[PDB]
Amino acid sequence: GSLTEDGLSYKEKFVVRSYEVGSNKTATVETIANLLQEVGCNHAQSVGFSTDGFATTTTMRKLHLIWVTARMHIEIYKYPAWGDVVEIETWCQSEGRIGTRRDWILKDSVTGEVTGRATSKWVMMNQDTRRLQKVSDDVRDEYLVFCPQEPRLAFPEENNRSLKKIPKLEDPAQYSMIGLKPRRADLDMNQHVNNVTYIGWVLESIPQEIVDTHELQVITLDYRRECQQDDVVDSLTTTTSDSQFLHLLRLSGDGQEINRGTTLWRKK
Amino acid sequence: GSLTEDGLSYKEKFVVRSYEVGSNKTATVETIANLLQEVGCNHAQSVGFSTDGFATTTTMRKLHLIWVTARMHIEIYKYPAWGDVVEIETWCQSEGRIGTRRDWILKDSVTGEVTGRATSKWVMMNQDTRRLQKVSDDVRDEYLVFCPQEPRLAFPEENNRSLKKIPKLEDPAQYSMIGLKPRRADLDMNQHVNNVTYIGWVLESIPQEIVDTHELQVITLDYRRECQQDDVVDSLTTTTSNDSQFLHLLRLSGDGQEINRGTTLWRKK
Numbered sequence: 001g002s003l004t005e006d007g008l009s010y011k012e013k014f015v016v017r018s019y020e021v022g023s024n025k026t027a028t029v030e031t032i033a034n035l036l037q038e039v040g041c042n043h044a045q046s047v048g049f050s051t052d053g054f055a056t057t058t059t060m061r062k063l064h065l066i067w068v069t070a071r072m073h074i075e076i077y078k079y080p081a082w083g084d085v086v087e088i089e090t091w092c093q094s095e096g097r098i099g100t101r102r103d104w105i106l107k108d109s110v111t112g113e114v115t116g117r118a119t120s121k122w123v124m125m126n127q128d129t130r131r132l133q134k135v136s137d138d139v140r141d142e143y144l145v146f147c148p149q150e151p152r153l154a155f156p157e158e159n160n161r162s163l164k165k166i167p168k169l170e171d172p173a174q175y176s177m178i179g180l181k182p183r184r185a186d187l188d189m190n191q192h193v194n195n196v197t198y199i200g201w202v203l204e205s206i207p208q209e210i211v212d213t214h215e216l217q218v219i220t221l222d223y224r225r226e227c228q229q230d231d232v233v234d235s236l237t238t239t240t241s242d243s244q245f246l247h248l249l250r251l252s253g254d255g256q257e258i259n260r261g262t263t264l265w266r267k268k
Numbered sequence: 269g270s271l272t273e274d275g276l277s278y279k280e281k282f283v284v285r286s287y288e289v290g291s292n293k294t295a296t297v298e299t300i301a302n303l304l305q306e307v308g309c310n311h312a313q314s315v316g317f318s319t320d321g322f323a324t325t326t327t328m329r330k331l332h333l334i335w336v337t338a339r340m341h342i343e344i345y346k347y348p349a350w351g352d353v354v355e356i357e358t359w360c361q362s363e364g365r366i367g368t369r370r371d372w373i374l375k376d377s378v379t380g381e382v383t384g385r386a387t388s389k390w391v392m393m394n395q396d397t398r399r400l401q402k403v404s405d406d407v408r409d410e411y412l413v414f415c416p417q418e419p420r421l422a423f424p425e426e427n428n429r430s431l432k433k434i435p436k437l438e439d440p441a442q443y444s445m446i447g448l449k450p451r452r453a454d455l456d457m458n459q460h461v462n463n464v465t466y467i468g469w470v471l472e473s474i475p476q477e478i479v480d481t482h483e484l485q486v487i488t489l490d491y492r493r494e495c496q497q498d499d500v501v502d503s504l505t506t507t508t509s510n511d512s513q514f515l516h517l518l519r520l521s522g523d524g525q526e527i528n529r530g531t532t533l534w535r536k537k
């Protein structure tokens with residue numbers, strides 16, 4: 001992997017592994033999501049930021065501030081087959097005082113064709129109190145030199161899927177998968193549940209017949225609260241329609257929302 | 269990755285990823301186990317075998333026979349750090365009519381030093397009836413040309429740990445993690461639970477304080493029966509012991525049917 005010529009984006013190639021593919025012998029969306037995090041981490045390292053999933057600058061560490069994902073949006077046109085090489089390009093944009101955005105483009109290394117695209121919204125938080133914050137001028141002015149100054153969007157189209165508001169699933173859910181809990185492999189180096197685990201949990205309540213006859217095309221996921229290591233989650237899904245679904249992850253006991261999202265599936 | 273000069277073994281380098289490491293910022297044993305399966309798959313593909321976790325010959329496919337793991341034994345001296353490159357060499361050996369063995373050696377790419385080793389026992393089974401069988405002469409004679417003829421062992425030592433008999437944990441277990449179930453990410457391309465998931469489930473019943481103060485050095489795991497996609501597993505652990513040793517048992521949550529048994533050895537950090 002390497003920073004591009006202008007130093008404002010990063011590229012890395014990955015050979016899809018035998019254990020990374022599903023029943024169609026192509027990479028799962030969780031494998032894709034893990035590769036997006038890996039290339040994001042390598043980009044942060046290359047330009048001098050923290051490497052731990054929080055991409056902090058010097059002033060942020062002094063203030064005990066971290067970056068946390070508010071939303072992940074992924075659209076896949078073709079999942080790479082086992083043994084294939086996929087090239088991923090990533091960059092960050094400053095969105096004023098709201099926060100930052102990290103975008104990605106996926107291409108087939110042999111054809112050069114765009115096979116997928118992703119975008120994510122990140123907000124600043126105190127790591128101890130968990131209190132959200134607007135980005136200050138002194139903090140923002142420090143990282144602006146690592147971003148393209150003009151807008152560069154993986155999802156440019158006006159009123160596109162990536163920015164749509166997601167409603168809250170109403171009980172009773174059409175489908176459910178209850179009592180999901182993280183194991184040590186679901187945790188990151190800081191003992192926090194990996195963001196990709198929540199995508200897997202959302203997908204658990206999709207019926208196996210949809211998975212067997214359809215390909216996932218778009219997933220949009222909002223992150224409201226963390227699942228702790230000793231928490232238990234219920235995954236709820238209701239058809240809203242191509243097949244479209246509305247999703248809700250909540251804590252198994254009190255029903256506290258942790259995530260909400262939508263998926264769009266194309267018949268094979 | 270590539271076959272070595274003599275065509276009897278295969279080597280591949282891997283750069284450790286950010287999501288592959290634990291609290292020590294080094295690769296977890298499940299990341300290591302996944303890399304061992306990946307290099308085994310690439311070796312099978314390079315010499316013309318099936319690529320699906322069953323490494324079948326044309327004759328085996330005709331007879332609906334597959335290879336299935338009976339035991340996995342891994343010993344790690346140093347876990348590779350995040351960003352480090354690890355080189356893994358793998359080869360297979362025919363063990364007469366009993367079955368086959370796949371061995372691996374792990375090295376730090378920069379120093380060339382052996383950082384770990386692993387060995388696994390594989391038995392032949394009918395895919396449909398799940399009935400085990402000895403290896404036939406016509407099947408064995410077909411794959412012997414892909415193995416070194418003289419013994420080449422990752423664990424040569426006399427009565428070494430890799431071949432030791434594992435006893436059955438007696439109730440009550442000292443520690444337990446109940447109601448473990450696989451999700452789609454735990455499944456392979458054939459919708460079977462990945463062998464590495466069982467290592468993760470075994471480790472779930474080790475107390476967090478042991479994980480925080482010790483490094484896993486050796487794990488030996490026997491595979492008795494598959495966990496199906498809709499099965500639920502209980503993970504049991506009892507201390508048997510500077511070094512801590514444990515006895516492990518995975519069984520189906522309802523009837524208590526054994527799926528795996530194993531042992532782990534941990535050294536204080």
Ligand SMILES: O=c1ccc2ccc(O)cc2o1
Nearest residue numbers: 043044049055056092143146
């Ligand atoms: O790799 C990057 C690029 C831009 C960027 C901007 C802010 C930040 O905190 C981390 C960042 O990492």
Ligand SMILES: O=c1ccc2ccc(O)cc2o1
Nearest residue numbers: 311312317323324360411414
């Ligand atoms: O890669 C290999 C090497 C030897 C070998 C021997 C038997 C077999 O079924 C698969 C095999 O794959």
